[PDB]
Design an enzyme around this catalytic site. Structure first.
Site, PDB file in Angstrom:
ATOM      1  N   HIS B  85       4.778   6.770   3.740  1.00 30.57           N
ATOM      2  CA  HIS B  85       4.284   6.378   2.429  1.00 30.57           C
ATOM      3  C   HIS B  85       4.731   4.953   2.116  1.00 30.57           C
ATOM      4  O   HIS B  85       5.790   4.518   2.568  1.00 30.57           O
ATOM      5  CB  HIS B  85       4.793   7.352   1.364  1.00 30.57           C
ATOM      6  CG  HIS B  85       4.263   8.745   1.516  1.00 30.57           C
ATOM      7  ND1 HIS B  85       3.372   9.304   0.626  1.00 30.57           N
ATOM      8  CD2 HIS B  85       4.537   9.708   2.428  1.00 30.57           C
ATOM      9  CE1 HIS B  85       3.116  10.550   0.984  1.00 30.57           C
ATOM     10  NE2 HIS B  85       3.801  10.817   2.083  1.00 30.57           N
ATOM     11  N   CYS B 127       6.367   1.918   8.721  1.00 31.02           N
ATOM     12  CA  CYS B 127       6.850   0.971   7.724  1.00 31.02           C
ATOM     13  C   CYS B 127       6.946  -0.415   8.341  1.00 31.02           C
ATOM     14  O   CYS B 127       7.192  -0.549   9.544  1.00 31.02           O
ATOM     15  CB  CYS B 127       8.232   1.393   7.221  1.00 31.02           C
ATOM     16  SG  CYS B 127       8.222   2.453   5.763  1.00 31.02           S
TER      17      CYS B 127
END
Lengths: 172, 214
Positions: B85, B127
């Site tokens: 996320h 990420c």
């Protein structure tokens, strides 16, 4: 736009940095109407340095660039840095003897690892280019280059391929 | 023209088995729309989609190990999909890295002979602090493909930074040419679109053949 504009004046530059593997590549890229120049003596630092200056160059009239390195630094080609090659393909064929990568668009990096006709990656990569190089898009061309090395090995190291190409690369 | 390219076997992956194969979508959450889209498109493409919501990465790996262990004799392929996320990071225990490090062995043709010569797809959303090198070491095995993008793991900007462009586009493509088009010219256009929308997708194949969800 679906397709890389591969009908410029010139095809582009092929810097082949280093015996028989270097030669075939040569033969074949010449038949792809690249201008091929061959760099002997290896060393790390020349290669880098040479690549610096090849990036320094007005490529406005070339379909792409191709850099091979055959064994037996990117920021130079990014669009900002090399805008004469921006949304043009920039091909990278390494035959090393572990490496990191990112970033940028329209990069491609074929990468095998070596341990009379030479390595299997090169034998197949040229056997392909020089038979379907002009018929097939690069990414299936190279796919079959994977299949032929996988598969022609045993009688009695696969290319790892990593692409940011934002279009279909055809040698027209 | 591939009519007539073969290779000391055959040109196109056999994609007409009984079942297409599993989709395993793992949400890396800390302390969703992407993850639903994905789901949908992978159902339109005929996958058996299970959607895991776990938080100890080790969970995600093991769940993978055990599915390697299954008999996919009747499978076209498999797809694993890790989605991390946006703009907060994570922590990982001492044995995760290693565990990541392994998880490819489970799928080789040796270790997994019901998927020998079948596409083993991976989509990683990661990420902008993780690495990708050949942190995610590119295995180097036949038939693997790893589509990989970075999600930003910090903050700013207003229009609350959207669903990923990797996923918006990937669903969009899959979801339009999924069936018209071979995987690499799909994932080529997924790259186009996130680039002609300005972290660009980094696809790494060892596919030995043309994959098309027929």
């Amino acid at each position: 736009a679906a397709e890389y504009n591969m009908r410029h004046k010139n095809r582009g530059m092929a810097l082949i940095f280093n015996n028989v593997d270097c030669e075939n590549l040569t033969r074949v890229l010449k038949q792809l109407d690249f201008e091929v120049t061959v760099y002997k003596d290896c060393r790390y630092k020349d290669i880098l340095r040479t690549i610096e200056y090849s990036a320094s160059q007005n490529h406005s009239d070339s379909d792409c660039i191709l850099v091979a390195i055959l064994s037996h630094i990117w920021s130079f080609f990014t669009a900002n840095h090399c805008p004469s090659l921006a949304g043009k393909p920039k091909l990278f064929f390494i035959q090393a003897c572990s490496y990191k990568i990112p970033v940028h668009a329209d990069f491609l990096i074929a990468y095998s690892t070596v341990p009379t006709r030479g390595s299997w990656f090169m034998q197949s990569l040229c056997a392909e280019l020089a038979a379907n190089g002009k018929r097939l898009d690069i990414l299936t061309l190279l796919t079959f280059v994977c299949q032929r090395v996988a598969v022609d090995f045993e009688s009695c190291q696969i290319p790892c391929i990593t692409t940011m190409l934002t279009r279909i690369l055809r040698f027209s």
